[PDB]
Amino acid sequence: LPIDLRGKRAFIAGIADDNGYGWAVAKSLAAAGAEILVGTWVPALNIFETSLRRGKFDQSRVLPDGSLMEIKKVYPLDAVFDNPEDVPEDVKANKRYAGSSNWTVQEAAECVRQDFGSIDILVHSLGNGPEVSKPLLETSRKGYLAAISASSYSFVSLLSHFLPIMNPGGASISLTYIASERIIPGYGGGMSSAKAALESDTRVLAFEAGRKQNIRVNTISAGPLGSRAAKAIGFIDTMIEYSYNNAPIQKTLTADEVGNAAAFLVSPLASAITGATIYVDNGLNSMGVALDSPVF
Amino acid sequence: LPIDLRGKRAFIAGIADDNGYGWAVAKSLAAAGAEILVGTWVPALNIFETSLRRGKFDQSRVLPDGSLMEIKKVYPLDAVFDNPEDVPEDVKANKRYAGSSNWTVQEAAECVRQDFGSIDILVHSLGNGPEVSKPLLETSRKGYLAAISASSYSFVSLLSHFLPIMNPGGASISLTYIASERIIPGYGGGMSSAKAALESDTRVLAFEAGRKQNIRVNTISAGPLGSRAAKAIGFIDTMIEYSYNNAPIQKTLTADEVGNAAAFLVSPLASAITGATIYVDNGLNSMGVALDSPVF
Amino acid sequence: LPIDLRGKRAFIAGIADDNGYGWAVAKSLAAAGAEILVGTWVPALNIFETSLRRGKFDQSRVLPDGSLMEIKKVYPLDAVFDNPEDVPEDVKANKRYAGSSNWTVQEAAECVRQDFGSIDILVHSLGNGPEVSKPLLETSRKGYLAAISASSYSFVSLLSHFLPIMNPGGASISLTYIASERIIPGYGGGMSSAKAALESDTRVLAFEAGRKQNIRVNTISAGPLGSRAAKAIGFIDTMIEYSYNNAPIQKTLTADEVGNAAAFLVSPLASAITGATIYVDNGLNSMGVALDSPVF
Amino acid sequence: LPIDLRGKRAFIAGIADDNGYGWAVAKSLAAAGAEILVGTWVPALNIFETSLRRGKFDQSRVLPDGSLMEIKKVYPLDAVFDNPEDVPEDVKANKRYAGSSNWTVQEAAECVRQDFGSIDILVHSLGNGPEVSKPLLETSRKGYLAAISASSYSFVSLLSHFLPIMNPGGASISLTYIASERIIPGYGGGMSSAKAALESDTRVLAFEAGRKQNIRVNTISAGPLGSRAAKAIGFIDTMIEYSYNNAPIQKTLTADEVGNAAAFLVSPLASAITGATIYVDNGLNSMGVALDSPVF
């Protein structure tokens, strides 16, 4: 009983190294037979491509079969910008941007349309919170709005823009986090607020795209992973040790584990699953208390 | 057993008339014996005051004890703007906005401080969505963000600002809606996303303000009430009628009922209640199927 | 704005000392003007009455007003037994039982009917788990079933039996616990399973009684309190310290705080609240992690 | 990307024919390459075997790879009874029950042990409610408990028993229903209470078995499928039709779809997923109003 994506195509918005979930989601979708089209945040695109081409990620490219993952094509992208009339002269002038073009979501989707004409799977695997290090109390309107835009509306734009080239029976998946639903000290700047909306949008978009084009929409609320961004937030390591001590099952969490879950959810086996928020966290979220409390 | 607010001051950002929830809360709080400060949205400000001069809501100010409400002072207010330094000379140029001043949330709170040195209760009963009529799929990033800015971040701003002059042991209340957690056709423009964020932040702010100033923070997920804003949305009547048909108890919903839950939630009686999302909707949210579906 | 129960009557199933929530729920309902009819588990009835009459609970009887709570009448009861044909000869012979009679739920309700003809409020505040000290894995079918019967169906019987004498506009409330919804190590024997069902039944009964007789049904998921039963489970003290360290607001939880919440929920102010599970726990449940983890 | 169960043994308590979910799971698991042990409820046992001798489900045993399922061994089983010492001589006297033996869960598991020394996967796909047709208000304590015993505790028993011969790294799956969390008219006899308990225990057992034997435990909240038991309930068709009308995606639901989610959830792919309640219902549970309501 395979998770079969053979003949399917996927657009993965959010890889820039072999260190996060997106890469992992990509091996899984690759491993299932899907054709990978990666969405790379412009700034990182150059180095990613270079590293990729020269082989920095070769081991990371080894599929379950021993074969290596192939990345069909890499498109530069910035999910905060929907169309060319939207970018600011400052943003355009802003260096890296000079080097690749057609990187707004609308443009990206267009290149893809022209390039392969359609996709089946759409994978959101990005976000950003300029003030993540601040408590909601110390978080500015702009910062808050930035987070919501980058981490939340970014999914709405991509889906909306790609939907027209998504083959019926296709699906999308995103990566959320428990902070949307529970208080997680340290995840500030409106990032919490952002997942909440991302998750809410999943249910809404599920209805809309489901009815519009029989496309499924879900999201995976993932456990902590020392990705690049995570390490940037700076609390992930403790979070990894927290999850290790206190989860129903005690073990490591691996990118791998979120990847397969995503591959499943975007496959035909998951045909009756839509509007979901699946927790791939070793059950952590289901705990009523932490085992490690000094009181115990 | 009284809900006792005597000697308590409350600042209710969110009245513009006597047709919506905010008025009801003022009332209940007035009834609870709290002193009423109000923050009307600048545009509506003049008319509101004017209307509340000619005795347009005289019948509407009568309390349970045939006593009359007494709104201490009305403040001009725009929750999208946190400080003067943030205003668009465009808005500033606007007549209403010219006709008033000190309306930024940072400005609004300083006045209360000077005028009254303090408060104990903050009520948020506003929000705006330029695109409520559009599906997430048809919703602009500008609109989504506007919706999240006026509807979610404004709470953050108000609380963050006023919190300094909140008396430890004080508390806050806001009004959310089910579309945040469940799919509700017609409630668009990212408003649903906005509620999700407003709800997520209640929890996080309960932690933040809870630990910083011993202030409580909750939100009430209210049922449909044909208010002025609900009027605009253009789907409430159906929802109202819908709720009549399909809730556990088949009855009406009156702001009055939302208004009492707020007074309670903001009173000492509710002291071990914080970071909650109390549904005051006649239990509709618990239903697993509409009773009025034709299959039945 | 008072919580007014004047002219109302309440039946409280579950007091045997002034140490738990039921007593607290009783002062609140008393304080609001309701007439108290207590339901005491037979075995404890004798001593409770004795202590009560002689004045062991006099201070505990002091209402907010300085006046003392009055307990209209005490009925003996055993909520595992619905009618006389249900008690086992062993149970009947079982000592304490000899001393009071008419103690099955059906009989109890009858005495009440005959005694006062109707009630408005119904308060469940009991349960029992013979194997609470055992993990679900080490818990026998009987033990599990016992817990469910005593702690869960006990509410269904009482409500069902009392409903016919409940005045329309009346309500009921019960006390649940987070273990139903999240993993709480130490609360075994199927007690976890029991709250889950108690909470589920609240939603169901809310629909049934709501539609049948316009009666409201809710439950309060309470924080830890060193009641007698709690101390019996043996983990409550650590739980109290856990809740103190890790809640959004740091403070003590007091019987008092659950009492007022219950008084509110059973009052007319709560007319649009039914099918609810309200958390009177200092926000504990909303936390995504424990602050006290050694990792932090 | 395969859902690989080769070399894995699975014990599926819950088949009595090819019309329900349990069969589907066996299939998917069969397909996944796992060896199929089955536990038919003694009454249905003879007929099931008989039916599965004459090739009554021959078409129904065909796998995705045109391969045929192959049920290693069928075990007679009654999940209300955990050991022989517990049987009512009344039941024992029963012909079917005479005609078979070793059917108590403790007995059933020892045979598997002897016969196969081990397992890796446990599927629970049964339950019974003598009173499903009665509202909680009309539901007997005997019926409620029977419902909870056959439907909730049986899982506890199976797991608890088999867990000793489960290979660390194994996992369990069960089938629950939305009535546990939401009000669903027609689903009575305390069945709803039973699901709530079954769901609550998944979490707790994920902790227990998770920490004790590194076994995972999840439940799938399935949508309506016109199975034999659903047939009896006498409300599925409506629910089925209802789900067609009001889910995010308007389509059918086939055991097949529940069956695949189980295979995944029990396969290594789902290794960081435990204590979950995955809704495989075409996203209906996320809807906030029935689209088919006449108000609309």
Ligand SMILES: [C][C][C]S(=O)(=O)N1N=[C]C2=C([C]=C([C])S2)[B@]1([O])O[C]1[C]([O])[C]([C]OP(=O)([O-])OP([O])(=O)O[C][C]2O[C](N3[C]=NC4=C3N=[C]N=C4[N])[C]([O])[C]2[O])O[C]1[N+]1=[C][C]=[C]C(C([N])=O)=[C]1
């Ligand atoms: C601050 C924020 C940011 S984000 O991204 O959003 N994040 N990060 C980190 C983290 C989180 C959470 C946690 C707990 S940690 B978050 O929020 O989220 C996340 C996301 O969404 C996803 C993925 O990520 P990761 O994998 O982790 O990382 P990386 O690898 O680094 O990735 C990222 C990406 O993105 C991109 N971008 C940015 N920006 C942008 C982009 N693109 C376009 N546009 C724009 N603007 C970059 O570059 C890269 O590619 O998932 C998530 N998570 C969840 C859960 C958990 C996690 C961990 N880590 O643990 C994560």
Ligand SMILES: [C][C][C]S(=O)(=O)N1N=[C]C2=C([C]=C([C])S2)[B@]1([O])O[C]1[C]([O])[C]([C]OP(=O)([O-])OP([O])(=O)O[C][C]2O[C](N3[C]=NC4=C3N=[C]N=C4[N])[C]([O])[C]2[O])O[C]1[N+]1=[C][C]=[C]C(C([N])=O)=[C]1
């Ligand atoms: C749509 C958008 C808006 S909001 O507001 O947010 N909303 N509205 C309406 C509605 C809703 C929902 C529904 C169902 S309907 B929503 O979303 O939310 C809400 C809020 O929170 C509150 C309020 O409302 P109401 O009361 O109803 O009305 P009114 O009276 O009209 O009020 C409003 C207010 O706001 C204000 N603002 C604006 N903007 C601004 C302001 N302020 C300041 N600043 C700024 N910028 C004005 O002025 C006015 O006064 O509530 C809520 N809810 C909830 C739920 C339900 C409801 C009903 N109604 O039903 C409501």
Ligand SMILES: [C][C][C]S(=O)(=O)N1N=[C]C2=C([C]=C([C])S2)[B@]1([O])O[C]1[C]([O])[C]([C]OP(=O)([O-])OP([O])(=O)O[C][C]2O[C](N3[C]=NC4=C3N=[C]N=C4[N])[C]([O])[C]2[O])O[C]1[N+]1=[C][C]=[C]C(C([N])=O)=[C]1
């Ligand atoms: C083992 C079990 C038992 S019970 O009761 O159910 N419980 N206890 C304890 C506890 C819990 C939980 C926790 C966390 S701790 B449980 O589960 O629950 C409870 C109940 O329900 C209520 C109340 O209680 P309290 O207040 O705690 O205590 P007390 O005072 O002791 O009370 C009790 C009562 O009951 C009665 N009974 C018995 N049995 C019976 C009766 N009656 C009739 N019949 C029969 N059979 C006695 O005697 C008395 O009166 O609530 C609850 N809670 C919840 C939450 C929390 C809590 C704390 N404590 O914390 C409690």
Ligand SMILES: [C][C][C]S(=O)(=O)N1N=[C]C2=C([C]=C([C])S2)[B@]1([O])O[C]1[C]([O])[C]([C]OP(=O)([O-])OP([O])(=O)O[C][C]2O[C](N3[C]=NC4=C3N=[C]N=C4[N])[C]([O])[C]2[O])O[C]1[N+]1=[C][C]=[C]C(C([N])=O)=[C]1
């Ligand atoms: C009613 C009561 C019973 S139960 O089973 O629990 N159920 N049924 C039906 C129905 C439900 C729900 C609905 C919606 S419908 B219920 O609750 O749950 C269920 C369970 O878990 C499972 C199974 O089912 P189905 O698959 O469907 O069917 P069938 O095939 O017929 O199966 C059953 C079985 O069981 C058994 N048993 C009995 N008793 C006993 C047993 N085993 C052992 N022991 C004892 N004692 C028999 O034999 C058979 O085989 O699933 C579920 N579900 C869920 C959801 C949904 C559904 C549908 N169908 O739709 C189902």
